[PDB]
C-alpha cells in the first residue's frame, strides 16, 4: 500500500528515501509505483523544453517551465544548460580549447572534487573511433583526459552483472548478480528484469560505491533512474544537487543512459539507425559539461564516461536448439540467449543426470555454435562458478549466436539484430573508459584494463577506503595525476629450507628405475656449484616467488631450473627456468624413456613413488621442467628427478608434451628468450582460491599424492624484444595460462587430430592473468625486479587475449 495523497512540494528528487506507506518523490518512485499524486506536475516539468532561446533571456521567472532563463536562475541553480551561451555570450564547453587541469579549481565550500559517473549501456569500444565525427563532446573528453582504447567487462557481458561490478569491484559470482535472470534455490526465488523481486536487497551482495561513501561520511546522489525520466531531467537534477549547501551536497553522482544499447538490440551494432543515438548521447554530455561550466565546476569535477559492455550482430536465424540434441528436452530448464544455463525442470525427478546431458551436447554437429561445460571446467579467467545461483551446466555460446530450448521459444516468445552476453574477451563485447578532471592525467592513453579495477580508483577519487574487492589496488595508478594508492608488497609467510645432500640412494624404496649408473674434478666441482644455485640468476629472473601462507617447502637448484618443492603436496609449487632464443630442443633418449630418479636432498617420506603410478590405471606423470629443453645430455638427468614429477592424465599429457616440446621453443624464438614458471593448482571447490590439504578430492590411487585440478605457466620476456629475456633493462611482457587438468580432451572437438591443430587453441581459451594464478596458489611473483611496484601490479593484471585489432 501507498498513501499517494501526500505532496512533493519542495521534495522533488529528495535524497533520503522514505518508506511505505508515505508517498515518495525520489528518482525511483516511478519504478515502485509510489510517487506522490503531484510528482509529475511538480518534479517532471516539461513546459517550453530544455533550451533557452534569445526571447527568454532575462524573462520573468515562471515556475511552470522545465528550466529557466531569468536573471535569478544561476542563484536558484536551475537555468537551462545553454543559458550562459544564449543569454550571456558564453561559449559551449565543447568549443573551448583543451587546457590542462593541473590543480582543482573549485568554488569555496567544496571539500573535494566531486565525482560524476556517466554510464552508457551497450557502448561498444569501437564507437569511440567509428562514431567520433558525430560525438564532439565525448571526443573532447577522450582526447583531453585519460582514455583506454577499450575496457574489458565481466562475464556474462550482461547489463546488471556489469553495472553492479562497476559499483562494487567484485566478480558476479561474489556480488551475486550472475545474470539479468536468476533462480536462487535457497530462497526459492526468481530475479527478473520485470517485477519487484529484483528490488529485494538479498540479491545484491558486496558493498556498492554509494554505501561505501555513506558509511565513511561522503554523501551520494542516487545512482538509479526510472526509465520514464528524460535524460535532460536527469542532468538538470544532478546540476541542481550540485547547487545544494555544502553540508547537504553529495560528492558522488551517477547518470545512466539506456542508449546506445536500446537501439543496438534493434538495429545491430553498426546499423545506420545507430548514428542518431550516438548524437543524442553526445548532446547529453554537452548539456552536463555546459551546466558544470555555468556552476564554475568544469575544472573541479572528475567525470568518468564508462560503458557496461558492447554489442554484437545476432539474428533469430542464428539460434541453436537444444531440441536438436536432447531426447529429454522437457526435463530441463534453460536460461537462454547469448549464454546457456541448464538445470533440472523438477527436483523430484531422479532420472535427471548432468553427465548424459553434457555428453549429448558435446561435439555433436560439425559446426556446433556453443560448447557445454560443467561450471568448474569453465576458463578460470571468467571467474564464473562459485555461486549457488550459477547452474552446474553452462553453455558458452559462439559470438553472433543464440541458444534456445525449442524453435517455438524464438517465434512465440525476426525482431532483433544485436545482442551481448558472450565471453568477455570477445572484441565486440569490449566497452569504453574515459576519465576527465583534475585528478586524471592530461592527454594520456592507458592500456586496456578490466572493469573490476574501477571501484578502487573511484574510492581513491573520493578519499574512501574500498571494501574488500577483486581489483588489485594500485594497478591503475598510471591513470591518475594525484591520489595514487601506494601499496607495499605482501610479507612472505613461509621461508624455504635449502636442503643439501642428506640421503643415500638405498634409503629409497619408490619402485622407480633409471639407466643413470653410467659414468673428474674439472666437471664435478661445477655440478656441485649448480646444486648450490650458481646458475640461479639465469633461471630465476624476478626473485623467488613468496609463499603467502604457512607451509613447509624446499628450494631446489639445478643447472637448467630452480624449484620450490612442497613437502606437504609432494611436488613443486613452482618451477622456474629460462629458455634463450638460441636454445635447442632434444628428444628423450631411448634408455631414459621411463627414468625416474630419487632426489638425495629430499627424504623418501616426502617423495612421490613410481609404484603408485604403476598401479593407478587412470593416472600417468609428467615433468614441470621439460627434459626436451635440457642444456646438455648430462643436465638432462636432473629433469628426471622425482621432485620434478607431477601427476598427469594421459589425455592431458598430450597437451603438456606439445606445450613443452614445441611451444616453449616457439615462444623463445618469437620473444627473444622466455622465462617460464610452471606449477600445479588445486581448486576443488572452484572458488578461485588455493585449496588447503583437507579440500583435495582426488589422490593418485593408494597414495597421498594430490591430483591438481589445473596446471599453470607464466611466460615472461622483455617488452623491448631487441633485448633478450635474461638481460632486460625495462618493462616486461607476460602471457599466462591455467589449463584444466582433465582426463579426456572432450573440450577440444578436433583432438583426434595432431596437436598442431588444437592444442594452442585450447591454451588460448585458458589464457589467464598472473593475478589469477596468485589467488589459486597463494604465491606472489615478480618480487625482485627493477620496476616500480605499481607497474608490476599492472603487469600482474594483464591478460593476453589473442583477439585481433579492435
Ligand atoms: C573477490 O573478492 C571477494 C571479497 O573480498 C572475495 O570474497 C570473500 O572471500 C572470503 C573467503 O571465501 C569470504 O570470507 C568468508 O566470510 C564469511 C562471512 O560472510 C558474510 O560476511 C561478509 C562480510 O560482510 C559478506 O560479504 C558475505 O557476503 C556473501 O554471502 C552472501 C550470501 O549469503 C551474498 O549476499 C554475497 O554476495 C556474498 O556471497 C559470496 O560469498 C560467499 C562466501 O561468503 C559464497 O558462499 C557465495 O557463493 C558468494 O560467492 C557474508 O554475508 C565467513 O563465515 C567465512 O568463514 C568460514 O570459513 C573459515 C575458514 O577459515 C572459518 O574460519 C569459519 O569458521 C567459517 O567456516 C564455517 O562455515 C563453513 C561454511 O558454512 C563451514 O564449513 C565450517 O565448518 C564453519 O562452520 C569466510 O571468512 C568473504 O565473505 C567473501 N566476500 C564476498 C563479498 O564475497 C573473493 O574470494 C574474491 N575472489 C577471488 C577469486 O579472489
Ligand atoms: C545496480 O544497478 C544499476 C542500475 C542503474 C539503473 O538506473 N538502471 C535501470 C535500467 C533498467 N535496465 C534495463 O531495462 C535493461 C537495459 C539493457 C538491457 N540489455 N539486455 N537487457 C536489458 C535490460 C538496466 C537498468 C539500469 C544504474 C546504475 C549505475 C551505476 C551502477 C549501477 C547501476
Ligand atoms: Ca547493458
Ligand atoms: Ca579453492
Ligand atoms: Na598409471
Ligand atoms: Na575431443
Ligand atoms: Zn542490452
Curated annotation (Swiss-Prot):
- Cellular component annotations (GO), alphabetically ordered: extracellular space; membrane
Which positions are annotated as binding 1-(9Z-octadecenoyl)-sn-glycero-3-phosphate? 159, 180, 261, 420
The cysteines covalently paired via disulfide bonds are: 8-25, 12-43, 23-36, 29-35, 52-69, 57-87, 67-80, 73-79, 98-144, 106-300, 316-414, 363-749, 512-610, 514-595, 718-728
Q: Where along this sequence does the record place binding of 1-hexadecanoyl-sn-glycero-3-phosphate?
A: 159, 180, 261, 420
Q: Where does Zn(2+) 1 bind?
A: 121, 159, 308-309
Q: Pfam families, from UniProt?
A: Endonuclease_NS, Phosphodiest, Somatomedin_B
For region Required for secretion, the annotated ranges are 773-794
What's the protein here called?
Answer: Autotaxin
Which residues are responsible for catalysis? 159
Q: What is known of its domains?
A: The nuclease-like domain is most probably catalytically inactive as residues that are essential for catalysis in the DNA/RNA non-specific endonucleases are not conserved. However, it is required for the stability of the protein and the catalytic activity born by the Phosphodiesterase domain.
Region annotation (Nuclease-like domain) ranges:
541-806
GO biological process terms on file: cell chemotaxis; cellular response to cadmium ion; cellular response to estradiol stimulus; estrous cycle; immune response; negative regulation of cell-matrix adhesion; phosphatidylcholine catabolic process; phospholipid catabolic process
| Species | Rattus norvegicus (Rat)
Found in which tissues? Abundantly expressed in cerebrum and cerebellum. Localized in secretory epithelial cells in the brain and the eye including choroid plexus epithelial cells, ciliary epithelial cells, iris pigment epithelial cells, and retinal pigment cells.
User: Which segment of this protein is annotated as the motif Cell attachment site?
Assistant: 76-78
EC numbers, comma separated: 3.1.4.39, 3.1.4.4
Q: Which gene encodes it?
A: Enpp2
User: Per the database entry, which stretches of residues form a coiled coil?
Assistant: none
Subcellular localization, as worded in the UniProt entry: Secreted
Amino acid at each position: 500500500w501507498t498513501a499517494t495523497s501526500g505532496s512533493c512540494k519542495g521534495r522533488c528528487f529528495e535524497l533520503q528515501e522514505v518508506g511505505p506507506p508515505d508517498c515518495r518523490c525520489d528518482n525511483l518512485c516511478k519504478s515502485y509505483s509510489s510517487c506522490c499524486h503531484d510528482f509529475d506536475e511538480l518534479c517532471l516539468k516539461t513546459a517550453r523544453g530544455w533550451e533557452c532561446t534569445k526571447d527568454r533571456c532575462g524573462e520573468v521567472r515562471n515556475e511552470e517551465n522545465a528550466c529557466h532563463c531569468s536573471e535569478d536562475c544561476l542563484s536558484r541553480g536551475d537555468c537551462c544548460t545553454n543559458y550562459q551561451v544564449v543569454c550571456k555570450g558564453e561559449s559551449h564547453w565543447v568549443d573551448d580549447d583543451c587546457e590542462e587541469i593541473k590543480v582543482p579549481e573549485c568554488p569555496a565550500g567544496f571539500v573535494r572534487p566531486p565525482l560524476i559517473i556517466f554510464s552508457v549501456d551497450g557502448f561498444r569500444a569501437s564507437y569511440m573511433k567509428k562514431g567520433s565525427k558525430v560525438m564532439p563532446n565525448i571526443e573532447k573528453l577522450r582526447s583531453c583526459g585519460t582514455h583506454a582504447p577499450y575496457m574489458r567487462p565481466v562475464y556474462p557481458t550482461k547489463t546488471f552483472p556489469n553495472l553492479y561490478t562497476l559499483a562494487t569491484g567484485l566478480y558476479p559470482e561474489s556480488h551475486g548478480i550472475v545474470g539479468n535472470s536468476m533462480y536462487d534455490p535457497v530462497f526459492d526465488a526468481s530475479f527478473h528484469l520485470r517485477g519487484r523481486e529484483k528490488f529485494n536487497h538479498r540479491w545484491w551482495g558486496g558493498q556498492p560505491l554509494w554505501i561505501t561513501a555513506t558509511k565513511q561520511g561522503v554523501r551520494a546522489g542516487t545512482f538509479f533512474w526510472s526509465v520514464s525520466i528524460p535524460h535532460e531531467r536527469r542532468i538538470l537534477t544532478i546540476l541542481q544537487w550540485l547547487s545544494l549547501p555544502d553540508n547537504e551536497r553529495p560528492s558522488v553522482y551517477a547518470f545512466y543512459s539506456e542508449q546506445p544499447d536500446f537501439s543496438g538490440h534493434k538495429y545491430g551494432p553498426f546499423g545506420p539507425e545507430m548514428t542518431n543515438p550516438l548524437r543524442e548521447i553526445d548532446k547529453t554530455v554537452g548539456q552536463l559539461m555546459d551546466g558544470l561550466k555555468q556552476l564554475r565546476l568544469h575544472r573541479c569535477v572528475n567525470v568518468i564516461f564508462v560503458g557496461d559492455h558492447g554489442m554484437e550482430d545476432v539474428t533469430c536465424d542464428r539460434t541453436e536448439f537444444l531440441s536438436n540434441y536432447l531426447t529429454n528436452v522437457d526435463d530441463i530448464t534453460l536460461v537462454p540467449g547469448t549464454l546457456g544455463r541448464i538445470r533440472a525442470k523438477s527436483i523430484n525427478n531422479s532420472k535427471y543426470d548432468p553427465k548424459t546431458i553434457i555428453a549429448a551436447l558435446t561435439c555433436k554437429k560439425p559446426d556446433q555454435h556453443f560448447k557445454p561445460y560443467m561450471k568448474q571446467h569453465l576458463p578460470k579467467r571468467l571467474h564464473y562458478a562459485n555461486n549457488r545461483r550459477i547452474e552446474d551446466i553452462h553453455l558458452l555460446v559462439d559470438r553472433r549466436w543464440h541458444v534456445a530450448r525449442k524453435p517455438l521459444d524464438v517465434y512465440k516468445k525476426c525482431f532483433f539484430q544485436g545482442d551481448h552476453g558472450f565471453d568477455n574477451k570477445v572484441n565486440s563485447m569490449q566497452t569504453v573508459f574515459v576519465g576527465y578532471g583534475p585528478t586524471f592525467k592530461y592527454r594520456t592513453k592507458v592500456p586496456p584494463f578490466e572493469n573490476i579495477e574501477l571501484y578502487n580508483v573511484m574510492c581513491d577519487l573520493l578519499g574512501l577506503k574500498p571494501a574488500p574487492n577483486n581489483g588489485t589496488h594500485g594497478s591503475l595508478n598510471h591513470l591518475l595525476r594525484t591520489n595514487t594508492f601506494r601499496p607495499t608488497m605482501p610479507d612472505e609467510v613461509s621461508r624455504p629450507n635449502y636442503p643439501g645432500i642428506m640421503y643415500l640412494q638405498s634409503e629409497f624404496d619408490l619402485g622407480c628405475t633409471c639407466d643413470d649408473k653410467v659414468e673428474n674434478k674439472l666437471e664435478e666441482l661445477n655440478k656441485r656449484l649448480h646444486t648450490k644455485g650458481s646458475t640461479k640468476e639465469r633461471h630465476l629472473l624476478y626473485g623467488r616467488p613468496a609463499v603467502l601462507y604457512r607451509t613447509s617447502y624446499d628450494i631446489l637448484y639445478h643447472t637448467d631450473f630452480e624449484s620450490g618443492y612442497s613437502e606437504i603436496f609432494l611436488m613443486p609449487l613452482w618451477t622456474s627456468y629460462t629458455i634463450s632464443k638460441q636454445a635447442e630442443v632434444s628428444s628423450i633418449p631411448e634408455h631414459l624413456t621411463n627414468c625416474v630418479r630419487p632426489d638425495v636432498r629430499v627424504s623418501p617420506g616426502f617423495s612421490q613413488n613410481c609404484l603408485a603410478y604403476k598401479n593407478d590405471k587412470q593416472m600417468s606423470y609428467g615433468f614441470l621442467f621439460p627434459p626436451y629443453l635440457s642444456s646438455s645430455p648430462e643436465a638432462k638427468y636432473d629433469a628426471f628427478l622425482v621432485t620434478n614429477m607431477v601427476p598427469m592424465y594421459p589425455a592431458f599429457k598430450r597437451v603438456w608434451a606439445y606445450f613443452q616440446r614445441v611451444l616453449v621453443k616457439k615462444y623463445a624464438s618469437e620473444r627473444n628468450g622466455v622465462n617460464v614458471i610452471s606449477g600445479p593448482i588445486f581448486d576443488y571447490n572452484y572458488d578461485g582460491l588455493r585449496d588447503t590439504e583437507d579440500e583435495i578430492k582426488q589422490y593418485v590411487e593408494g597414495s597421498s599424492i594430490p591430483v591438481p585440478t589445473h596446471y599453470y605457466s607464466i611466460i615472461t620476456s622483455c617488452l623491448d624484444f631487441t633485448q633478450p629475456a635474461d638481460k632486460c633493462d625495462g618493462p616486461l611482457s607476460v602471457s599466462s595460462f591455467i589449463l584444466p587438468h582433465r582426463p579426456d580432451n572432450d573440450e577440444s572437438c578436433n583432438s583426434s587430430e595432431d596437436e598442431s591443430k588444437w592444442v594452442e587453441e585450447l591454451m588460448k581459451m585458458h589464457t589467464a592473468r598472473v593475478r589469477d594464478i596468485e589467488h589459486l596458489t597463494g604465491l606472489d611473483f615478480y618480487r625482485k625486479t627493477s620496476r616500480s611496484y605499481s607497474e608490476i601490479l599492472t603487469l600482474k593484471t594483464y591478460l593476453h587475449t589473442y583477439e585481433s585489432e579492435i
